[PDB]
Amino acid sequence: RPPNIVLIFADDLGYGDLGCYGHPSSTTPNLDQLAAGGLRFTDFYVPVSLGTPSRAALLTGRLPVRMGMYPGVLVPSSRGGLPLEEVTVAEVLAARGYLTGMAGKWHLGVGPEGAFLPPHQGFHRFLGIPYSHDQGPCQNLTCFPPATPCDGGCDQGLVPIPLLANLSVEAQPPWLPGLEARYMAFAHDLMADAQRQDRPFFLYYASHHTHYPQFSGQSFAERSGRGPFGDSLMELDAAVGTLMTAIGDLGLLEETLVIFTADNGPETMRMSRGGCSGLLRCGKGTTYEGGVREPALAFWPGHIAPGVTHELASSLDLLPTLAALAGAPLPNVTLDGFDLSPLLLGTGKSPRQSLFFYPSYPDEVRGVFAVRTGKYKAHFFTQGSAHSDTTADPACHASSSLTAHEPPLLYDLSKDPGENYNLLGATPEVLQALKQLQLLKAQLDAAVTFGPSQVARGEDPALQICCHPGCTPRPACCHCP
Amino acid sequence: RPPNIVLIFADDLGYGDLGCYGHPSSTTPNLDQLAAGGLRFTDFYVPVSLGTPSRAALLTGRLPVRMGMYPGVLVPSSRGGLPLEEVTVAEVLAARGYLTGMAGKWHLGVGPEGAFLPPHQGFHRFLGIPYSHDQGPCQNLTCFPPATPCDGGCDQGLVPIPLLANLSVEAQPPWLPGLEARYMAFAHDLMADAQRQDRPFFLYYASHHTHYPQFSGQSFAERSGRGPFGDSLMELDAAVGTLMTAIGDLGLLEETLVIFTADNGPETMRMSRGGCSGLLRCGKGTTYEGGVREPALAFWPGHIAPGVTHELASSLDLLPTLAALAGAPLPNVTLDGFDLSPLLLGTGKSPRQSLFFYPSYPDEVRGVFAVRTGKYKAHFFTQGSAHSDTTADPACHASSSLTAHEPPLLYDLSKDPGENYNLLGATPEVLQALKQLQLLKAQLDAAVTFGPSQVARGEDPALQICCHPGCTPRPACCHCP
Numbered sequence A, B: 001r002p003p004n005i006v007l008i009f010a011d012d013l014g015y016g017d018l019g020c021y022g023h024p025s026s027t028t029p030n031l032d033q034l035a036a037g038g039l040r041f042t043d044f045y046v047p048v049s050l051g052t053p054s055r056a057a058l059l060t061g062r063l064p065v066r067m068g069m070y071p072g073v074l075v076p077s078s079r080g081g082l083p084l085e086e087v088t089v090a091e092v093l094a095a096r097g098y099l100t101g102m103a104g105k106w107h108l109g110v111g112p113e114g115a116f117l118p119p120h121q122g123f124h125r126f127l128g129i130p131y132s133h134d135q136g137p138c139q140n141l142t143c144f145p146p147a148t149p150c151d152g153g154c155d156q157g158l159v160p161i162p163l164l165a166n167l168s169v170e171a172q173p174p175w176l177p178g179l180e181a182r183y184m185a186f187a188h189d190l191m192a193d194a195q196r197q198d199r200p201f202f203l204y205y206a207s208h209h210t211h212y213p214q215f216s217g218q219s220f221a222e223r224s225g226r227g228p229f230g231d232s233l234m235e236l237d238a239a240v241g242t243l244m245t246a247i248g249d250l251g252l253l254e255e256t257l258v259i260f261t262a263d264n265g266p267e268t269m270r271m272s273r274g275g276c277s278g279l280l281r282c283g284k285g286t287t288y289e290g291g292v293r294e295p296a297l298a299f300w301p302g303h304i305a306p307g308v309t310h311e312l313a314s315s316l317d318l319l320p321t322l323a324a325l326a327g328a329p330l331p332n333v334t335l336d337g338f339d340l341s342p343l344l345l346g347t348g349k350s351p352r353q354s355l356f357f358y359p360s361y362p363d364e365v366r367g368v369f370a371v372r373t374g375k376y377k378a379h380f381f382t383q384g385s386a387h388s389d390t391t392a393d394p395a396c397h398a399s400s401s402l403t404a405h406e407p408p409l410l411y412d413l414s415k416d417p418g419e420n421y422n423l424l425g426a427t428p429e430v431l432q433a434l435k436q437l438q439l440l441k442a443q444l445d446a447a448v449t450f451g452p453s454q455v456a457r458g459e460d461p462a463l464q465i466c467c468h469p470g471c472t473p474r475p476a477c478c479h480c481p
């Protein structure tokens, strides 16, 4: 009965990059066709616009500050990770008899002997990199075949990037141009095996596209009309087409729910090798709309009618929506998301009315930075980010320091999705929204306790993964292509 | 059964002016002796530190913004006044059979044909001035006998100040040096008449001391050791001694509850002819402690034991406390005060935990300026005032513009009653108080609707009281000494 679920999650992909979201030069045919036969969201969000906190909110349905996933992101030597008491979507579904698998980027911790890796958090199978593909030296890696080097060199002084098969190093570093093929092969096996055992599968595909540095296989190099950022987006798009064909071939089209979203806004610091937030303001690292609002598509033939919704939805609602769909019971913890099945099935409206946004570096004195309720969004604090540097808007830059706003900056997103015109710079409708927004912020700030910081547990270079354990000299000896 | 109640309310009198509150040169023997045989409050407050809003909160037990008593104060030509639907303490007690009377300053409105004057708000008898004694020309009035003129001239272009007997002009202007004697005579008659009819009395004595310009009868001129401000405080003090003697003479000491407080902090703009907030900061016109915290004494032999309380109390609690004491039922409206009888009778604690402070000029976008809960006080907005000009502290001056604080300025008043050291300039106790304070402000701001402004209804010079109605030329012809 339960449907097969495929969750595709891109990296550093903006609201404005898909062809079907208006980009003028992107090449995204498979995703455009998924949009045309399914539900496209205009108002779907993540609560925090950084890699780690966003992946944690997705898998647990819980605001990242509750389990210490702040500040910033995790690094290869981090001691901390997503606590093992947290229940993930993979576990909710595993206990209901799903065969669960994950391909790609984890970024939720490695820890002493890989205690925080995926196999310990409900995934039966796992093929991927445990953090971002730029958190290790890349001046000698090939990003585009036959021999175009990755640009800029990535993070120095670390072990090369490891490709893992569950808990074992399969390659270090992997060959970037062939990663996609590896991941499609893995996905195909997971599907077929689940079919054979008469059980539903759950595929978590956490792509490295479109994070820096850009790369692709040889079928896409110089073929998109948007340079390296495009080639890489085009490969991600072809991966979606490949998964849809594999779902075709096995006669599972009407029994599989396919969801596509992305973790956080574009890193405009990469300039034309980085994403695009379209009409929205600023990008990764900020609580402006270009940082937190992402593309989101839902496709399930004969169940989800083709259309466009403007209803409020969050990555936080994915656990409870998927549980409900699979007839799995919810964990016994406070959750911050809701079941969106009525909306998906067209029998009801989204139950979500409000959204809460935390910054990259949160603190308990300040609390939530921005809150949206209906079409209104208030900003109590504003701050630019180096990840959103280089565009013409000065509020996006790292030089825009942390600034308090009281009364808050107040925008009507139905008319000013670009956050250009502060309404408080009077009306009874506005005043009532203002008072609601202020009370929602004070209620959440008083009820939420911050879990102890995982990131502040520190770093220990002995925690880096090494293909040749015991090796010397570290870290350059750790390798095995 | 119900006790006789005498409520003495001074004008522009600071926390630091009574001898029993530490002043080094004031002469206040009767009040010091009342303090020595009764209850002295260290933490008693008014919600707004201006004449009109404070008198409204006292008589109704309701925050002044609910019935439009803002912004600023009322003037002789004001069209507005305290709405007649509001229920006052005088009415609560009149309906329980009290013989009620008021001597002194009203400042709650005059209106077309004196519709807002005291006789329409539950007082049986009324002898006094309908607004402050400086809201009319005083360059020719004698402030101190035999012929010392009032200093500075007061407000120009208006009708002289009227002394009224219910709704009729008894004199215009009155002779300042003999006002006290008039008021004591009136008080004595009210007491005796109530005794004779076997009924309890309620005397509301709203003194003009110690508002500018200072004045006194001849027994006090140049006799205090603190100049004109002192002479005037000394007369107010002798008035209290006279009322206590009159209560003695009629054998009513153990059957009468006597309360003394003041409406708002000192006007330091008058320099050494103005009051003193002692250790507290700033004065009239501000939401700093020297503006809102006043002297307060309760005396009732054989019922209230002599002592000092630090418990929280407000002018807002006087209606409900007096109702309860007289066995009178409370009006059917939302009240913002509580019954303090247990505290007064020494059988319980004050039920009040929090206090809310509004500025002279409030608005619905900003809401409450400052909130106190337990020993903590947060300031969300700060602002100086011309009424608090001339001292060495720059935050008190009119040049200190309206400033938002987020996070708020946070003080521990048990250790820093002077509001000098911001705690947020960390601890778990502090953080919990912070979150409580923020939530209390957002709850009150969301629940309180501002009543339509009475003061903004405008002015009409035809509303000025005239001893010779029809007169010309106005306003100088209006007079009758």
Ligand SMILES: *[C@H]1O[C@H](CO)[C@@H](O[C@@H]2O[C@H](CO)[C@@H](O)[C@H](O)[C@H]2NC(C)=O)[C@H](O)[C@H]1NC(C)=O
Pocket (backbone or CB within 6 Å): A099, A124, A125, A126, A127, A165, A166, A186, A189, A193
């Ligand atoms: C690591 O672990 C999984 C299982 O723990 C490995 O896979 C299994 O895959 C083969 C066929 O592909 C089956 O015969 C087994 O039954 C599978 N087990 C389960 C529980 O599914 C796999 O080689 C590794 N994960 C991947 C795909 O890298």
Ligand SMILES: *[C@H]1O[C@H](CO)[C@@H](O[C@@H]2O[C@H](CO)[C@@H](O)[C@H](O)[C@H]2NC(C)=O)[C@H](O)[C@H]1NC(C)=O
Pocket (backbone or CB within 6 Å): B099, B124, B125, B126, B127, B165, B166, B186, B189, B193
């Ligand atoms: C105006 O009104 C009151 C009454 O409305 C006047 O006073 C009364 O006072 C005399 C004795 O002083 C009594 O004989 C009457 O019974 C009183 N009436 C009440 C209801 O108390 C008074 O002259 C005026 N008020 C004052 C004192 O100025």
Ligand SMILES: [Mg+2]
Pocket (backbone or CB within 6 Å): A011, A012, A050, A051, A263, A264
């Ligand atoms: Mg990312």
Ligand SMILES: [Mg+2]
Pocket (backbone or CB within 6 Å): B011, B012, B050, B051, B263, B264
């Ligand atoms: Mg006053």
